[PDB]
């Protein structure tokens, strides 16, 4: 559910200090979430209420879904990659998160 407890258990880290907890939960998690959102070619919402609210205001695009567990763990994997290494070493384009994220992709083609 991408709460604080799940992130704490994934990273095996206690985020006691306000500064690093703020860093991890406000600059490192939204980055992964919106990266997966950009890759999927669709908008993802946490609960049904948020999806309905976004559709009502018209800001939600076509083909929206509420996040399954596979997409949430792909986001967790991206976050775990972000936490570990903090440089620009150069990596393969298709990692192990894309294998989980791919079946939910939409608008593929040429």
């Amino acid at each position: 559910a991408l709460t604080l407890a799940m992130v704490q258990r994934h990273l095996q880290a206690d985020l006691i200090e306000d500064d690093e907890r703020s860093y991890v939960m406000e600059q490192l998690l939204p980055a992964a979430r919106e990266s997966a959102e950009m890759f999927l070619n669709r908008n993802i919402y946490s609960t049904s209420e948020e999806l309905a609210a976004a559709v009502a205001a018209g800001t939600a695009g076509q083909y929206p879904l509420v996040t399954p567990r596979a997409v949430e763990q792909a986001i967790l994997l991206m976050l775990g990659d972000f936490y570990r290494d903090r440089e620009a070493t150069g990596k393969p384009v298709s990692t192990s998160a894309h294998n989980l994220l791919y079946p939910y992709r939409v608008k593929v083609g040429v």
Partner: protein, 102 residues
């Protein structure tokens, strides 16, 4: 209908559900209908298969079959070229005296 005339085959290095297959095909049709150019992002690829529709359709075999049937019925295949000697009047003479007399 067997699919022995297909030429171009796309290829993607991942596992797709069937809905993604219809989406890919519809996207290709839309792209070619709108006058655009394919780009093949990521791991997509295209290969052309070296086929020959004449060999798929057996034109030589069917020509030989036509000739064989004509020979079977004792009608020369070059009688007046009904299947595929300068004057025409000689052609009817050959036709008569070789096929219709018996």
């Amino acid at each position: 209908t067997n699919g022995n005339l297909q030429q171009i085959y796309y290829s993607v290095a991942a596992f797709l559900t069937p809905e993604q297959r219809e989406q890919f095909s519809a996207n290709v049709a839309q792209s070619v209908e709108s006058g655009r150019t394919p780009v093949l992002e990521g791991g997509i690829d295209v290969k052309a298969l070296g086929l020959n529709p004449a060999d798929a359709q057996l034109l030589q075999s069917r020509n030989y079959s036509v000739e064989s049937i004509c020979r079977f019925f004792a009608v020369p295949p070059s009688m007046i070229g009904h299947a595929s000697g300068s004057g025409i009047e000689a052609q009817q003479l050959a036709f008569l005296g070789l096929t219709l007399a018996p």
